[PDB]
Amino acid sequence: QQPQNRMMKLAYLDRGFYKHYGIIVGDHVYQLDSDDIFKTALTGKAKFTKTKLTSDWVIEEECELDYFRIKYLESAVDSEHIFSVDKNCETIAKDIFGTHTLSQHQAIGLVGTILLTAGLMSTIKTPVNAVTIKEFFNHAMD
Amino acid sequence: QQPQNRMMKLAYLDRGFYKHYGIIVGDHVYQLDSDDIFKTALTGKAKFTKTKLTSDWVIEEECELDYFRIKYLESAVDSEHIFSVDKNCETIAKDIFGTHTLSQHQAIGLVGTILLTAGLMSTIKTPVNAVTIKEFFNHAMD
Ligand code: NA
Numbered sequence: 001q002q003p004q005n006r007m008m009k010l011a012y013l014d015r016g017f018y019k020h021y022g023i024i025v026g027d028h029v030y031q032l033d034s035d036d037i038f039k040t041a042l043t044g045k046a047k048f049t050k051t052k053l054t055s056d057w058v059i060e061e062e063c064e065l066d067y068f069r070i071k072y073l074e075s076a077v078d079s080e081h082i083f084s085v086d087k088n089c090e091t092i093a094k095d096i097f098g099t100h101t102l103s104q105h106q107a108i109g110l111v112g113t114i115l116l117t118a119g120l121m122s123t124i125k126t127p128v129n130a131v132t133i134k135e136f137f138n139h140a141m142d
Numbered sequence: 143q144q145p146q147n148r149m150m151k152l153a154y155l156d157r158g159f160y161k162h163y164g165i166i167v168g169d170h171v172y173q174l175d176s177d178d179i180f181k182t183a184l185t186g187k188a189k190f191t192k193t194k195l196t197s198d199w200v201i202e203e204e205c206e207l208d209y210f211r212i213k214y215l216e217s218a219v220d221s222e223h224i225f226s227v228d229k230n231c232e233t234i235a236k237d238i239f240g241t242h243t244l245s246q247h248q249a250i251g252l253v254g255t256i257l258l259t260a261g262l263m264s265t266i267k268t269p270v271n272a273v274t275i276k277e278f279f280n281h282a283m284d
Contacts, residue, residue, distance in 0.1 A: 010275075019270065038262055042255060044186020044224040063272045068279060075283035082186040113184060117278045120180050121268040128152075128161065128260045130205040136259045137210060141217035 006098040008065050008111075010118070011057040019122040021060065021115045025095045027053045032112065033086060037119045042140055046116060048108055050088040060118070065097065072110040083112035148240040150207050150253075152260070153199040161264040163202070163257045167237040169195045172253065175228060179261045184282055188258060190250055192230035202260075207239065214252040225254035 011029060012019035015037075022031035033049040034040045085092060085108060093107035094100060102110070126132055153171065154161040164173035175191040176182045227234060227250060235249035236242060244252070268274055 010270075012270075021270070038259060041183035041262060042224065042258060060270055061272060063275065067276055071279065071283055082184070113282055114275060114279060116184060117180060117282055118270045118275055120183060120262075120265065121270050121274065121278060123262065123265060123267060125265060125267050126263040128154075128163070128263050129203050132263065133152075133205065133256060133260055134209055136263060137256060138213065140255055140259055141213055 004064065006065050006096075007062050008096065008114075009062050010060045010114075012060055012118075012122070013056055014058065017124055018119055019060075021118040021122075022051075022057065023096055023111060023115075024053055024057065024059070028095075029053055029057060030089065030092055030096060030111070032115055032119075036139065037116075037123060038136065038140060040116060041120070044082055046083050046112060048083065048085045048089045048092060048112070050086075050092070068110055068114065069097075069102070072106065072113075076106070076109055079109075081109040081112060083108040146206065148207050148238075149204050150238070150256075151204050152202040152256075154202055154260075154264075155198055156200060159266050160261055161202075163260040163264075164193075164199065165238055165253060165257070166195055166199070166201075170237075171195050171199060172231065172234055172238060174254070174257055174261070178281065179258075179265060180278065181282060182258065183262070186224050188225050188254055190225065190227040190231045190234060190254070192228075192234070210252055210256065211239070211244075214248065214255075218251060221251070223251040223254065225250040 009024040011024050012021045018037045022029035028050050032046045040046045093102050093104050151166040154163045160179045164171035170192050174188045182188050235246045
C-alpha cells in the first residue's frame, strides 16, 4: 500500500432520489444538515453537522484529499461561500484534515463543495413537465 | 379551448448534462444567467436575464401558473431568496404574470424556483468516485 497523506472516507445515506454524503472520522460523520438536496440548492445556504456513525452509512470510497487541498488553496482565496457550522463542528478542520493548515472557513468551504457536489451528482434525472414541476415546487416550499 | 389565466411557456436549451430552462414572453426568454447549474447551486446566487427567442429553444410544455402563484403566496410570503435581475428584466413581473399583483421580488422568487428546480431535475445522474468528484470539483472552482 502506497504512501498517502490524510484521506477522506466519503460515505452516504441513500435517500432514493439522491445520496446524502458525509466524511467519516472515527465514530462520527460530518455532513450537511440538509434533509433535501434541492432545498440546499435553492436557499443558498448549508450548515455542517456531526452525527454518530451508523450502519446506514455506506462508504462510497476512500479518496485522497491532496488534489482538493491544492486546488482549493489555488482558487478559493479568502472568498465567501455558502457554508457554516452548527454547534457540533468545533474540531471539523483538524478532524477531517489532520492538521491546522486549513482554517475552519477553508475546511468547510472545501469539504462543503465536495459534499454538495457529490449530492448533486447523485440526483436522479427526472422528466420536467407540468406534473413533476408541481411535485418538486411543492416540495421546495415545504 | 378552455379558460386559462396567464400560462407559462416553459422552454429550454439542451446543454447535454442539463437542460437550461426559460420562460418565453413574445420573442424574448427570461432565464437564469448561468452556464453551469451546479455552480449556481454552489454559489447561492442566480440572476435573471432576458434574451431573444431563437430556434435552439425547445418548447417543453405550456403550464398553468395559477397553482404556483397560490402556493408561493401561501408558502414563502416575503421570504428572502437567491434570485436577482440584470438590466434586461425591468418588466419581468408584468411580462410573465400579466399584472402588477406580484412585486419584482415575489415574481423572480417564484419563477427562479421553477427554473432552477427544473434545471436541477434534468441533470444526468453521475457516479460519484475519486475520478468524477475531482472532475466536478475542478469545474466548481471555475
Ligand atoms: Na441529476
